[PDB]
Design a protein around this ligand. Structure first.
Ligand SMILES: Nc1ncnc2c1ncn2[C@@H]1O[C@H](COP(=O)(O)OP(=O)(O)O)[C@@H](O)[C@H]1O
Ligand SMILES: Nc1ncnc2c1ncn2[C@@H]1O[C@H](COP(=O)(O)OP(=O)(O)O)[C@@H](O)[C@H]1O
Ligand SMILES: Nc1ncnc2c1ncn2[C@@H]1O[C@H](COP(=O)(O)OP(=O)(O)O)[C@@H](O)[C@H]1O
Ligand SMILES: Nc1ncnc2c1ncn2[C@@H]1O[C@H](COP(=O)(O)OP(=O)(O)O)[C@@H](O)[C@H]1O
Ligand SMILES: Nc1ncnc2c1ncn2[C@@H]1O[C@H](COP(=O)(O)OP(=O)(O)O)[C@@H](O)[C@H]1O
Ligand SMILES: Nc1ncnc2c1ncn2[C@@H]1O[C@H](COP(=O)(O)OP(=O)(O)O)[C@@H](O)[C@H]1O
Ligand SMILES: O=C(O)C(=O)C[C@H](O)[C@H](O)CO
Ligand SMILES: O=C(O)C(=O)C[C@H](O)[C@H](O)CO
Ligand SMILES: O=C(O)C(=O)C[C@H](O)[C@H](O)CO
Ligand SMILES: O=C(O)C(=O)C[C@H](O)[C@H](O)CO
Ligand SMILES: O=C(O)C(=O)C[C@H](O)[C@H](O)CO
Ligand SMILES: O=C(O)C(=O)C[C@H](O)[C@H](O)CO
Lengths: 301, 301, 301, 301, 301, 301
């Protein structure tokens, strides 16, 4: 029944209505966030049978997250409000472009995900299993969870799509590669941004040799992206649009690709689709508000 | 020379613009809170020389706490940004009155507060040293600070004011009673709200027997308040207005009482002043936004 | 198994942010309404298994109706988007109380509702079938549906609940009385608001004689309400709060009564529950935004 | 033919969206005010043919005054934009009720108003000529206009209505009393608010003796109002609603009284009408935003 | 006295504050719309004596429309609130550019306009008579109205300016041309957009031969426009500006041209002016909010 | 202790939330303004010991200004609320770019600054003394103040940095040069915009010969700027950013330069820094909201 299964800790996003330092702000918008959540919702809007695995707290915010996933029609068979608090963060985008994020996630009910965080018979028949580097950077349990996950998916013959999503706050470049070197063996698909490649490896190049998965997609910001399949290297043109809030764009990019593959799409149409979802998210507010719905696809370049 | 010195954990309050369940709110108002901070501003606006002692993380909200403090005129000699984050809390006020609160302050830069947090010589010549039962509830480190704090003011001939401000989310009634029995000997003035007394000492009367400090004041909500000084029991009438946002209405109360005290007025005037301040805030949004200014008093009533 | 099944025309409500004449309003708040939809959500939030049967056009607002329904947990097995548009209505609440309403629903996708709209077997084992006098007023097609609907639930041993909810803009008192005399035999529980009774049956007492259904409840605004069960007449005290937006306060009422019923409680508790729900909504904006959740009840009062 | 002609200084009012000290407000609501303008709109909305005589600078706000006037239907035959600026004023309404006002109108284009400001023949056949004690307080130039104005209406058999509307910021009680003793002989109807009477004539009763005009009405706030016509003293009950923004509640009052008068109704109806208008505005924001329309009356009450 | 006379059904516009699907919105801005209304108001702001012919409903929205036309100083001698409802629509502009509109106009009081919808002696002396394709697409009566109109105008020697404004929702391409083929004989001036030309004819070219009026202006989006007079073909440069809401731009374009002609302007200055008004409307929110006022003209390129 | 000392009259700014004529607006944002204030705050955010000299009124707005200067940590040793009103102005930015400002400053408490407006021993040790052409254009006293100021600064060996900031409303081009010709002798640094140079002199060229100060900086809008030191002429590249509200940009530019010099920066790094602060202010709302803080500098090109 289910084609994709993404997992990790969801978050509630607090953002200023316009650029400027957070200190001068007095009104914050609230959105639902979380790399996997963003992926889970983007896939669902596309008409893809997706399911999300994770925990929120027994508070008002966890209830917000659940309604978003539920209204979006994402499988929550293994998602539920567990005792504890729902993590949140505050963002701030400066006039010229400098941006910083403040987390209030340490200890959340969502950062508990330990191995066996669900029934492996869930993954049966499933095409993909998308996870993001943020999760394992959350808790020893989380790190344990990641690995276990893909293993149990591959065991079911389910392809493992992963997105680096390196976050400086959550851990150092070392521990990052350490994780990578370890989990790369089962990763059928790896999503990576250019900055990340040069921040954890120095030069995109070395990054690309160490991290060799069957299929690898490099998000190059507005310069589109590069998909690596069959030694052959494809390039994708980015959709030119005014970048409202670049947050969530990468996940939409990843979500767009996965829908491409799931629908058995040629590496080009999978890239075109990815850049499209990423331009929508970038062109809007919130973490995944701009995710398109299938019925919108046809009319988009 | 400073007349009052307040100290505790600064906080940032998030508030829906109107009643309802937080889960449905899309916007949040940002306010500078903290029990002792509220007391400190109030006094600052009243012309009383007040100093606040505390720590905000080295982030944007901490800067916002710092900028509000400076804006008011609260001496920050011993207040400063230190590594870590500034704690924040959300607030829900339901259609039928009763609402809930959610903290994001555990492990914050402010809940560090331990003994020798500031140079005691600070308290020299200071009329009062204000604390709140919230402070010692934040951590053993802070619990000790509280004790050291008043022992150091007592040693300086400074009056020690304490407001139970008991918060169940923080510690149990027992954990609270315990701190009270040990603190009380150092307390000259005690503020209490009927609820807290009944929720901690069965019935108001009992609480009063146990906490027999030189001067004790009982906030009875809009139903007035009794001041117990020298075997005498003055009862003070409450001001009438519609309960907007009552959060911190007690801190406004305490500050007005203290100001009158510091101003050497009768018990009947401290209670009026204290009642006026409290109502003005409860009629206002935020945590101490409605606190009146010196100029205003002369006419109000 | 479903305990309640509601059905009628979903609606989108537009509301000025505060009182005044609509002609001067520059902004409108968007809410999900519909009498039976309001009842359905309320129950959904209370833990009662409820199903809504209806149609929204194949447009953006219809999707919004659908997404709210899903968010709450209302079974849409027999609810779905069908060609046409979703009806909407504006709302004016004047400075001195009395306000006016304006519909844009004639010819909508929802006002189609005709016999055999859903598969009757749906009602199997269902405690109640809720309808509203609004439904049969929308069209001969819908008027028949109503009749067929309850005849099909009656045939299934399902209790048939009906709320007059008479709207003059829709049909005349006569056109309404007529539908009532013919419907009534199939009705087990009847909800009525003094006004509607006097505006349709001269005086409350008369209306009561004519509409003598097994169980009848009279909403007397904030002045309480009488429940007429088994020759007995229980009178239930109303909750006190300030009339924010009373629209749909009756649907909240009906839903709380039904829940208590479905929960097998005394008449005295159904009226309390019913009164609590109603007040919570009237104290809130939108159509059922203030409806309380299971968790909340345990403490409210 | 015009039934009423009003005249004075138009104004733009700036208002915080809710109570509190202006110093902290970051947004201001923009409204079209002016005592005589308020009276003029009210009448315009009531179906009474009214003309306003005044000047707005040749700027954007003046255009806004002009556009509101036109929108309502107030004859601007003798109203027009002239070099200079349009005056504006801010408004502060504190948590505990009492608030303050701040003018920015000195030297404005409207405070020019001098004798022969308009062609007197205008007043021909006009039931009333309305003025306000605000006008002559603006400048010797305007003070004279006032006098000339009513002497010219009296000369035309037009009734001269005057509303003390005393503003301390403008002139002293003396400077005001003085204008009153000299104006009064030309006044047929006088509106006064208890406060102004006590703040200018010690006690209400005294003021009444001094200002013995043919018809005199005493606005006693929400506590009603007495109408003194032909040795008789009719007392009119006030409408009940919560004091939103009371600014200009008196102008709404005066306009409703005048309308009833112009409509040849009993004193008991003018007071009801006058009380209704006033309450509707006080229940609304702005200066005359809540003023009801003809259509509305028929039902209100 | 009157130079131009435009006619058709006015509408109230409901629009999101930012891009994104209407389903995720919760606040809508309200503006007055209607191709002719937009034209009528734009002309008036330019200092052109214009008059609007049409009907709104006896509701709050029709009252909004009238105040806009009245405040803007547009002749309403033959415009009035007739019994019934005022039409409205909802718009939605997507992140990348895809847009869709939802109508709630079928049956409005404004869609009744049948022949003799006013006194032909109105058109005497009038230079132009602007109508738009939307009107005849409204009701058989409307279609009858259009034709009759121009006829009665030409009969008075008044030039007939028309703007295609093809709308897919309101009717098919066939019926569109059918109308065109019929009414073209009296159309002295035709306004057409490039998309329209290729959607009702296929290629701009054929469109331009079939539809041959004395003077024809082709709106080519941002690529400016082409005016066809005397076999000679002129081209106009579009004003480069960020396109806020492209709705209403075409009417402003048409309005700008007409003011050019009315003022006896060279085909170039008539085009320059048209592109200017169209850039203003495009550069702002609402349907015609951005229409400039004459006093602004000089300072604009 | 103090490095820079700027002086002049502060103002409160009222601005529309989006472009469009002020007449159509209904909500205004409030910000603190004043060329020197903007300079004073920008310097302080940079970590420069600055002090502001000037007067505000004894009203709510003067209290707003003081909190901004105080929170920003600007020396107010010689700044204080003197009896009287605080000046304000209204701005309005049109769709295409045309902008106009409306002043309500004539007579403000801040426009009194006469010679000896502070204790000259204030300037001791001070590096700079920045003033702006607006001040002397305010009141004869103000003009007297300007001159006296620099004199007393030079007397202390403090460099005199001045910014033309010609304002058409406040005075004519003649009186402007008249002032310039007079005060240029003590001006060590002159800031001038290109338009100003061609509006008071005709051609930038002549402007540059008459006005020859040791160091002169020409703000050329987005084309960066030109710094003239040692006969040598340097050029600065402007930061490309979308211009939100260009108001305050010049002062930020001036503030950025001064921080450059104060920090002993090479004419290039002083220009780079200036263009940076000017791009921030231009890229944000308000008069100086976008001023960066030192900790932000490193990460900015
Ligand atoms: N301004 C933009 N315009 C178009 N596409 C964008 C823009 N910003 C991001 N994207 C899309 O999102 C994908 C990722 O961009 P990127 O920002 O690097 O991911 P991340 O969320 O990690 O920052 C890109 O490959 C691109 O297709
Ligand atoms: N609705 C109200 N009206 C007037 N005064 C109030 C109101 N709510 C609180 N206060 C004032 O605040 C003081 C404390 O009330 P209380 O609510 O008990 O403090 P706390 O914030 O701890 O709950 C009271 O004694 C009273 O003077
Ligand atoms: N202002 C109010 N305060 C408390 N309860 C209210 C209020 N308005 C409505 N209710 C509740 O809603 C129920 C119905 O009131 P009513 O207004 O008559 O329903 P309806 O929405 O049909 O008008 C009442 O019996 C009462 O419990
Ligand atoms: N809160 C209120 N409720 C009802 N009517 C009010 C209220 N405030 C003012 N009014 C009406 O306005 C009229 C005048 O009240 P008042 O406040 O004295 O005028 P003013 O604007 O000059 O102060 C009153 O006689 C009354 O009818
Ligand atoms: N983004 C834009 N920039 C400048 N002018 C525009 C823009 N969008 C529309 N216009 C102006 O409006 C006129 C019509 O544009 P168009 O959008 O094609 O009409 P329509 O309202 O039918 O869509 C054009 O000829 C042009 O002058
Ligand atoms: N749109 C913009 N982009 C970048 N820098 C700008 C922009 N507008 C202004 N600036 C900066 O502000 C400085 C002054 O610009 P300018 O507008 O001419 O000063 P002013 O405030 O007097 O108008 C310039 O030299 C430039 O560095
Ligand atoms: O950055 C994080 O911590 C998140 O997971 C929240 C964001 O929505 C996510 O990163 C988007 O990429
Ligand atoms: O709860 C706390 O810790 C706070 O200090 C926040 C509020 O400002 C406080 O409760 C008001 O007394
Ligand atoms: O009036 C209707 O048809 C509705 O159902 C809309 C409201 O939600 C309903 O009146 C509330 O009972
Ligand atoms: O105070 C004034 O001068 C005004 O006219 C403004 C207000 O509209 C007036 O006070 C209301 O009566
Ligand atoms: O599109 C319609 O139905 C309208 O007439 C409303 C719009 O304002 C008009 O089309 C603008 O071109
Ligand atoms: O223009 C004026 O009058 C001001 O001083 C206020 C502005 O903030 C200043 O000019 C910015 O350059």
């Amino acid at each position: 029944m289910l084609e994709v299964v993404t997992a990790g800790e969801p978050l509630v996003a607090l953002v200023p209505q316009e650029p400027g330092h957070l200190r001068g702000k007095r009104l914050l918008e609230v959105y639902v966030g979380g790399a996997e959540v963003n992926v889970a919702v983007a896939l669902a809007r596309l008409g893809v049978k997706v399911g999300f695995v994770g925990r929120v707290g027994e508070d008002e915010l966890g209830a917000m997250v659940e309604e978003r996933l539920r209204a979006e029609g994402v499988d929550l068979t293994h998602f539920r409000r567990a005792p504890g608090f729902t993590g949140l963060y505050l963002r701030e985008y400066l006039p010229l472009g400098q941006g910083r994020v403040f987390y209030y996630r340490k200890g959340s009910a969502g950062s508990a995900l330990a191995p066996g965080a669900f029934d492996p018979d869930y993954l049966e028949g499933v095409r993909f299993l998308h996870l993001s580097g943020i999760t394992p950077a959350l808790s020893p349990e989380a790190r344990a969870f990641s690995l276990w996950a893909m293993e149990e998916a591959k065991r079911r013959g389910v392809r493992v799509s992963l997105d680096v999503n390196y976050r400086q706050t959550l851990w150092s470049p070392e521990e990052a590669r350490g994780f990578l070197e370890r989990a790369l063996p089962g990763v059928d698909l790896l999503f990576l941004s250019e900055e990340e490649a040069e921040l954890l490896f120095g030069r995109v190049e070395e990054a690309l040799r160490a991290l060799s998965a069957p299929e690898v997609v490099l998000k190059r910001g507005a310069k589109g992206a590069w998909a690596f399949v069959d030694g052959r290297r494809v390039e994708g043109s980015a959709f030119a649009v005014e970048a409202v809030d670049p947050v969530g764009a990468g996940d939409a990019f990843a979500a767009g690709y996965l829908a491409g593959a799931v629908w058995g799409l040629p590496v080009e149409e999978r890239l075109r689709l990815a850049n499209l979802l990423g331009a929508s998210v970038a062109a809007s507010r919130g973490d995944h508000e701009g995710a398109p719905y299938r019925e919108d696809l046809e009319v988009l370049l």
